[PDB]
Design a protein around this ligand. Structure first.
Ligand SMILES: CC[C@H](C)[C@H]1O[C@]2(CC[C@@H]1C)C[C@@H]1C[C@@H](C/C=C(\C)[C@@H](O[C@H]3C[C@H](OC)[C@@H](O[C@H]4C[C@H](OC)[C@@H](O)[C@H](C)O4)[C@H](C)O3)[C@@H](C)/C=C/C=C3\CO[C@@H]4[C@H](O)C(C)=C[C@@H](C(=O)O1)[C@]34O)O2
Ligand SMILES: CC[C@H](C)[C@H]1O[C@]2(CC[C@@H]1C)C[C@@H]1C[C@@H](C/C=C(\C)[C@@H](O[C@H]3C[C@H](OC)[C@@H](O[C@H]4C[C@H](OC)[C@@H](O)[C@H](C)O4)[C@H](C)O3)[C@@H](C)/C=C/C=C3\CO[C@@H]4[C@H](O)C(C)=C[C@@H](C(=O)O1)[C@]34O)O2
Ligand SMILES: CC[C@H](C)[C@H]1O[C@]2(CC[C@@H]1C)C[C@@H]1C[C@@H](C/C=C(\C)[C@@H](O[C@H]3C[C@H](OC)[C@@H](O[C@H]4C[C@H](OC)[C@@H](O)[C@H](C)O4)[C@H](C)O3)[C@@H](C)/C=C/C=C3\CO[C@@H]4[C@H](O)C(C)=C[C@@H](C(=O)O1)[C@]34O)O2
Ligand SMILES: CC[C@H](C)[C@H]1O[C@]2(CC[C@@H]1C)C[C@@H]1C[C@@H](C/C=C(\C)[C@@H](O[C@H]3C[C@H](OC)[C@@H](O[C@H]4C[C@H](OC)[C@@H](O)[C@H](C)O4)[C@H](C)O3)[C@@H](C)/C=C/C=C3\CO[C@@H]4[C@H](O)C(C)=C[C@@H](C(=O)O1)[C@]34O)O2
Ligand SMILES: CCCCCCCCCCCCCCCC(=O)O
Ligand SMILES: *[C@@H]1O[C@H](CO)[C@@H](O)[C@H](O)[C@H]1NC(C)=O
Lengths: 346, 355, 355, 356, 355
């Protein structure tokens, strides 16, 4: 519909989009950009965060639902004072017949539009010629993660909006002056999202043999909640260390009792470490949680090595000094480690 | 004739512009909404979502689509004709992935009355987002949310209303496997404001109650068996250090695996849940079982250090601890159990008042 | 001698005046549609999601007076599948359907045949994932009924009525064999007309009776469970004073039995009722727990002589407890095994009578 | 002498009067279509869902008298892939397909070539998720036959007949070494005509024989099972009166075998017949279980004397002779079992190899 | 001066007589297409499925004589992406591809530029899942070669020939860091022409060399394996007459080690050749297994004594074996460790030579 000035246009209604919009788009070519061979277009961009979530660590991505707003002055699309209203709120189906910038998310993994009952798009045309197109999009963006300091880490995730076909001489993207990213009252399960967003901007890309292209970036600061890992990792490992100390009160001559206590404690901690690796990606650097697990394994290992010394001393022909000292120092040394560890990581 | 009429109602001669809303430059059009729930299921805690199959019906009076020449009222039209008429742009704001069916043909209905009322029913499958409060996790009630908003038309053009009679209808013999869907549904008006303007929205809430049968058989009973197994140690010989220590450690380690397994399904939340209290106390009881033999072993060996009369006192002390423990550990567990189950039923009673 | 291309425009053409929008016999008796299905593949039954997937050929026959030809002397004229776009087709859809799709591997998998009287044959290849509610009171050895519901979305009982074919309504592919189920050769064809707010709609239902095969479950859960029970019994022959060996033996069997029960629930839904497998796993756990429970009594009885000829009687009592146990535990298990299988067999017969 | 555009319109154009809706030789002999298969990619054989994936090129040749030309001297013409929408193309669908898609990576992946005599060569890139029934009676040392059925949905054999090309029906790629299977060179080509109430329809079938590679199962299944059986025999050298050690050794070995057997069934479908792997695991489980019974007997016999000195010595001597014979018999009987198990399955496989 | 819209119509239009069905330079020299690739992201390398995913910009350049323009002074006029249908484009496609899709975020992600000489530049945003056969011997320390094949389905080498661009054929985005792999900067551009029964078709190939980071493998498998070997050595300092203690220690280490070996196969595909992680796991099992036989010999030798001189001799031999084992077992492991790494280091060096 409306292509080539809606063919004959024999119909004669009275002062509707049958007349106004068809008269507006009688000589409109969506293939030719506004202000052809002249000033590059300036496209104001806004985002509204419908839902933020699904920060997956295995694939290092997150999925967001947003509304994309754009604004650009179109000289051809000027209301000829026929309507005293500053807006038209035309049918959403009309987006196909008007020029639109070729915005695309450079870091995106998968995108889909949404068709609940109709196309989820809003088109507005002000009197001066400005156009406001809104669109409902669900985008899966890619976020590189630095998992050092893992249980207690902060992560910056970006969103880059750039053009694919028009260079910086024809099309230019900029962020809206006031409130560019209007978030929603949302809550994340495992993360905390601040209201301070770094509107970095620039990001202008240079590709060899094609030229410069415009880009705009919005960086989101996410802080991880440490509550889950307290109950999940730190408390279980701390418990197993306490069981390891129980051997120091069990009889020195109870070889068949203390030895199972030592070995089953060490092997239980090792299995707990393996389970943690399953969710995390196969990174090659050490994480903060690892220094905790190494020390817990070291204390577990040192309990069994302590008994081996006792068994040598008893059979060497006393050994009660070794056990008595172990009862005091082993909790005491663990206390110092905890003080240094938590203080270092605040 | 039938064929000629359809052209007359909306065709090239008619001049019906599908791009102009009814009552243009005038009062907003009134939209009445119906929902019939054909299927409810796929409630996943991990992703905090649920899936529904519904029939969405909309009614709006269109003055242009008024016919007097055919005597019959509410003549049913062909589904394919729906491209020609103006249809409101409904969408589910809290939705995640929607799909039409088209199993053999478009699952759509169209009816036009003499006065101009339109009825437009479509079959939709929806994956909707439901935020969940996983406190009181085994004994909880969850409110699901379904929001119908207009993306393109403001309050001057498009207003939404709920049907007075039978707004939400549930199919007969619909049984959720893990939940009990209550028969009281709350309908409210929640208008949305953005920087573009005001947009109509209507919301329907479903009150769901979690069935307690599965968790009792599969979580509470297995946990209460390990605690009892620990108590067997209080009858094993005091001198049997390999046996009681072996029995002690096995129970504590097994309980640790069960506690981790319980939290495997539901998400990684940063608050304390009801199941966590139960597992923690169970871990405390089994750990205290391991920590009672250690005190008995130590108190006994102290005789070696009136040497015989020193020997008697220590040996008696050890036995007393074991005998007292045999009745003490079940009794304290019993007192905890009655406190645990009474408070949560009280809290559950408060929750249904909120619902 | 009529040209084929020219004839194909005399019907289903602009010159013809055939309107696919208007149903046959407008303002008159309902259209009679006979339907057949061919079961090309059955499988992908999933307990967790309570659905199954089937690939079928759906044939429909209705009499269109307009599509009557006399120039060609052929009894029937197979036509190109592309022509189906220009003919009125009933809006059949499946009410229990979760997902369905068409097949476009090389061409559209459709078949149209038109007879001289005006009959139409319209065969479509479809694959549907159908929802089946399941009753799991007996997790093995049960009979599950899977239904297929074919109804009209937009045409009421005044316009479109669906009927099953008198002969061969459901035909199954030669040599179809489900891996874990047995499909019965008797299929119940009934009527379930639907009433909604928008009117009454035709619906026809075909149900399939599926019987679970016991071969897999016997060698993978029942025999492993039997091994754990018989392993526990050897403790009665282990030395009475060997506390580390017997206590370690008792606890290990009980904990492994617990894991085996946990393995069973992996593929099952979180149902709140009691299943048949739960009875077996509970009784097996009861036997192994009792064997550990027995040793605690023997240990408590045995040590009494030293703490308290009284020596001989206490020792004698402990040995007799072991001696009776060596025959009591096997015999009592045997009585349970006889009772468990025979009671459920008559239950199986009762469920077989109910189909 | 003729512009290419004009030839494209003069033949099969609206002026020409070629209707793709009517098949060639209407009210006449059946159209004969020759078929070819080039296997671009074979893999993703999944036991659990009993399917496999394949990437193929499907070539069909059929003689159309209407599509004949004399204007151009060339024997053949590589026509544009986009203009296929006005060609009459036979309907071909796969009876055992569980899923398929076209490929649109950059353009339409199709080839059309029209010869002077009217022959048409039409090639398509397809990815097929085909379903094959699998025996699994002998999970190791088995040969599986996969099926590809090419049949017509709308045209009966009086109209459309499908045949197999005389030379090079199925053509495998240069490599295409499957990780878990070995694809035999010989491929069976058969006719399996289908009969329905609608009518009789043509169909052609190609069977592929796949032999499972035994290297993975030996390293990761049989050898771990062998280790536990040997580990059990260590109990026949430990002290006779060391009840915690020997009973602890016996239980840990038996329970480990149960978890090893449980691991194997995970990757397999829930079939209701006894597989070859089941017989191995059962016999190995029988051996390790019998070791536990051996300690039970010697423990009972040793203390039987208490329940004068002459009886005590005889019982202890009786107890010790059990240990001596056990440490020799248990390896030897397992050795004898291994010879019977492997030899029978090889002769069974060899006879099946003749069948396959 | 002359209106922009007319140029769109006057060139490559109905008035122009441009035919997109007919390739440039018909009945003449083959069209030569130069290809560029810009790798936006590289990742998702999966050994199990032997594939990897990539996001690229595919640029093609060819010379169409029919598109020369001299009316406008400017060169390299950007066109609109929506009008690419009427442009003739080569039928490039990927031979080893398993799943590919276009990108439609807001508009089509396509760029078209046309120079005055007729040269055309056409870039597309594509996401590729590409099949990559892998040789998984030397699994922890393995360099992997990935290939990308670009060849023509419908045009033979008489019409369409593909060549790699002289400057910057394969370009990698700045700061692209694979998670577990390292991508070498040297890229192999080869010609692998394809021959079929249909004919000969042009093909160009690009090879990528990927080195596997061994940080993860050392921390999660090698270091835990060291613990089990070391923990086994603790038994050599435990008392000789501690059969429950020492055998229990032996069994726990050996059985835990087997589970650790079974952990590795989870991600690996089922292959029938020996890998390098197998040679490590096999030797580690040998060391712990030989420790169990070490105590078994000591236990057997000690009891062999049953005058007084005999028990002196046998008891010394059992003690001597333990002291020798305390140095022999660590020493032999050190010898194996030195030989293992140096052998696998020289092989890795040759792998770099093989690229
Ligand atoms: C302190 C541990 C020592 C070793 C004792 O541990 C044991 C046994 C005896 C040792 C002396 C077992 C231990 C619990 C303690 C007793 C503890 C409680 C009854 C509660 O716990 C504390 C700890 C908790 O944070 C560890 C703490 O902070 C809160 C702050 C915030 O709320 C205000 C909240 O936002 C944040 C998330 O958490 C809070 C004061 O509540 C009770 C809630 C315990 C829950 C812990 C667990 C349940 O499943 C977990 C895991 O799956 C498993 C394998 C082991 C469990 C465990 O290990 O449970 C487990 O980790 O006793
Ligand atoms: C030395 C290990 C013995 C067995 C000790 O293990 C324990 C306790 C006592 C034993 C004596 C426990 C062990 C850690 C160690 C302490 C180790 C470290 C603090 C680090 O390791 C060193 C050693 C490593 O060289 C083996 C060395 O790299 C070489 C080669 C490199 O070339 C590429 C070269 O760049 C470099 C210069 O030098 C490097 C300095 O990193 C630290 C990175 C290790 C963390 C290990 C673990 C955390 O989670 C893992 C796992 O999920 C689990 C189940 C067990 C953990 C564990 O097993 O923890 C675990 O595997 O102590
Ligand atoms: C009673 C627990 C103590 C610790 C005893 O446990 C053991 C051994 C000895 C201890 C003294 C083992 C224990 C079962 C009990 C014996 C119990 C039964 C034989 C049955 O149960 C009764 C009790 C149950 O009430 C919760 C009772 O209510 C019903 C009411 C309703 O119907 C009218 C029903 O809608 C509602 C949901 O439930 C009902 C009469 O069924 C039998 C069904 C037991 C099932 C339990 C289990 C099977 O697999 C589970 C789990 O996967 C596993 C790892 C351990 C099992 C277990 O732990 O089994 C397990 O949890 O003995
Ligand atoms: C010999 C078994 C006894 C039980 C010994 O086992 C142990 C300990 C002591 C016992 C006396 C442990 C055992 C290995 C052996 C020593 C064996 C080796 C060092 C190698 O093996 C040989 C034998 C093998 O022939 C089956 C032989 O054929 C090849 C021929 C072809 O190559 C030319 C090859 O294409 C074809 C596939 O196979 C070949 C020479 O490789 C080494 C490769 C062993 C690997 C085994 C394993 C690694 O992870 C597996 C598993 O995940 C686990 C839980 C246990 C491991 C194990 O159980 O490892 C495991 O199964 O010692
Ligand atoms: C544990 C042993 C840590 C030291 C490893 C050094 C060799 C690193 C890789 C060299 C190679 O590829 O062989
Ligand atoms: C549009 O035109 C009609 C008559 O053609 C007139 O009545 C109406 O007021 C006009 N609308 C305006 C001027 O906004």
């Amino acid at each position: 519909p409306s292509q080539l000035s809606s063919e004959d246009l024999a119909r004669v209604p009275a002062n509707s989009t049958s007349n106004i919009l068809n008269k507006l788009l009688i000589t409109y070519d969506p293939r030719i950009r506004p202000n052809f061979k002249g000033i590059p277009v300036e496209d104001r961009v806004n985002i509204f965060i419908n839902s933020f979530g699904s920060i997956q660590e295995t694939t290092m991505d997150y999925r967001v639902n947003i509304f994309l707003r754009q604004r650009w002055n179109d000289p051809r699309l000027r209301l000829p004072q026929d309507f005293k209203s500053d807006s038209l709120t035309v049918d959403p189906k009309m987006f196909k017949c008007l020029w639109k910038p070729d915005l695309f998310f450079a870091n995106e993994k998968s995108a889909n539009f949404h068709d609940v009952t109709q196309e989820n798009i809003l088109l507005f045309i002000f009197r001066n010629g400005d156009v406001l197109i809104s669109m409902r999009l669900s985008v899966t963006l890619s976020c590189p993660l630095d998992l050092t300091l893992f249980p207690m880490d902060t992560q910056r995730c970006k969103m880059q909006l750039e053009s694919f076909g028009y260079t910086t001489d024809d099309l230019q993207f900029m962020w809206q002056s006031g409130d560019p990213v209007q978030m929603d009252e949302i809550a994340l399960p495992q993360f905390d999202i601040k209201q301070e967003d770094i509107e970095y901007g620039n990001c202008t890309k240079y590709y060899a043999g094609t030229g410069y292209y415009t880009c705009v970036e919005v960086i989101f600061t996410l802080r991880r909640q440490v509550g889950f890992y307290m109950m999940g990792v730190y408390a279980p490992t701390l418990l197993i260390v306490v069981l390891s100390w129980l051997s120091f009160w069990i009889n020195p001559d109870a070889s068949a009792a203390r030895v199972p206590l030592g070995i089953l404690s060490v092997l239980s901690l090792s299995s707990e470490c393996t389970s943690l690796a399953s969710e995390l990606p196969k990174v090659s650097y050490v994480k903060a949680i690892d220094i905790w697990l190494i020390a817990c394994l070291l204390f577990g290992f040192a309990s069994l090595v302590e008994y081996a010394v006792v068994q040598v001393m008893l059979n060497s022909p006393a050994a009660k000094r070794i056990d008595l000292y172990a009862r005091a120092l082993f909790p005491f040394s663990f206390l110092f480690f905890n003080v240094i560890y938590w203080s270092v990581y605040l | 004739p039938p064929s000629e009429f359809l052209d007359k109602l909306m065709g090239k001669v008619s001049g019906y512009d599908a791009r102009i809303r009814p009552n243009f430059k005038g009062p907003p059009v009134n939209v009445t909404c119906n929902i019939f729930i054909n299927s409810f299921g796929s409630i996943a805690e991990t992703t905090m979502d649920y899936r529904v199959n519904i029939f969405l019906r909309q009614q709006w009076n269109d003055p242009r689509l008024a016919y007097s020449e055919y005597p019959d009222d509410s003549l049913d039209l062909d589904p394919s004709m729906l491209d020609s008429i103006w249809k409101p742009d409904l969408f589910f704001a809290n939705e995640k992935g929607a799909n039409f069916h088209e199993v053999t043909t478009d699952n759509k209905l169209l009816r036009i009355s003499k006065n101009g009322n339109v009825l437009y029913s479509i079959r939709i499958t929806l994956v909707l987002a439901c935020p969940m409060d996983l406190k009181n996790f085994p004994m909880d009630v969850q409110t699901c949310i379904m929001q119908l908003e207009s993306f393109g038309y403001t309050m001057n053009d498009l207003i939404f209303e709920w049907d007075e009679k039978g707004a939400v209808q549930v199919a007969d013999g619909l049984t959720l496997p893990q939940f009990i869907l209550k028969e009281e549904k709350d309908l409210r008006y929640c208008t949305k404001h953005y920087n573009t303007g005001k947009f109509t929205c209507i919301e329907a809430r479903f009150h769901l109650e979690r069935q307690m049968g599965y968790y009792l058989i599969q979580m509470y009973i297995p946990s209460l068996l390990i605690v009892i197994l620990s108590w067997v140690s209080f009858w094993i010989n005091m001198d049997a250090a390999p046996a009681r220590v072996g029995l002690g450690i096995t129970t504590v380690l097994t309980m640790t695996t069960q506690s981790s397994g319980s939290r495997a399904s539901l998400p990684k939340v940063s608050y304390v849940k009801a199941i966590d209290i139960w597992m923690a106390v169970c871990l405390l009881f089994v750990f205290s079982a391991l920590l009672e033999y250690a005190a008995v072993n130590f108190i006994a060996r102290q005789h070696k250090e009136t040497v015989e009369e020193m020997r008697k006192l220590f040996i008696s002390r050890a036995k007393r601890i074991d005998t007292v423990s045999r009745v003490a550990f079940p009794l304290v567990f019993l007192i905890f159990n009655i406190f645990y189950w009474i408070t949560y039923k009280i809290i559950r009673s408060e929750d249904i008042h909120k619902q």
